[PDB]
Design brief:
The structure is cut from a larger assembly and holds three copies of chain A. Chain A is low in regular secondary structure. Helices cover 9% and strands 0% of the residues of chain A. The A-B interface holds A 11-12, 15-23, 25 and B 21-29. Chains A, B, C: It comes from Varicella-zoster virus (strain Oka vaccine).
Chain lengths: 46, 46, 46
């Protein structure tokens, strides 16, 4: 058994363009990204 | 260990006229700033 | 008697689970879109 993990090249593609607290982002125009299937997701919040 | 606060590279991007916070994420492109990871975020009523 | 299907050429707006707000549009912009009349929608954990 295996699951697709989360692959990222920079924090920009996951933190979008805003000004405030922490958040989440997905693929906008070029940087494809999918939700992480690993159970270790809530640990160490951003 | 030390607690690094948030730096203000520019005096015009820290207006925070929209009740301090507007969005729910960070910058995307040109902004020289360091995220304040210290839990002591309360330093005088701004 | 049958039921209308649910498919679209642009699957990038449905494959990703936003887990929140979504586009409340009754018709697509240019791609084909048929409303699903199935009693159960969004089966299996996306």
């Amino acid at each position: 058994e295996a699951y697709p993990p989360l692959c990222s090249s920079d924090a920009a593609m996951l933190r979008t363009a805003h000004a405030g607290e922490t958040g989440a982002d997905e693929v906008h125009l070029a940087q494809y990204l999918i939700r992480d299937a690993s159970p270790l997701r809530g640990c160490l919040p951003l």
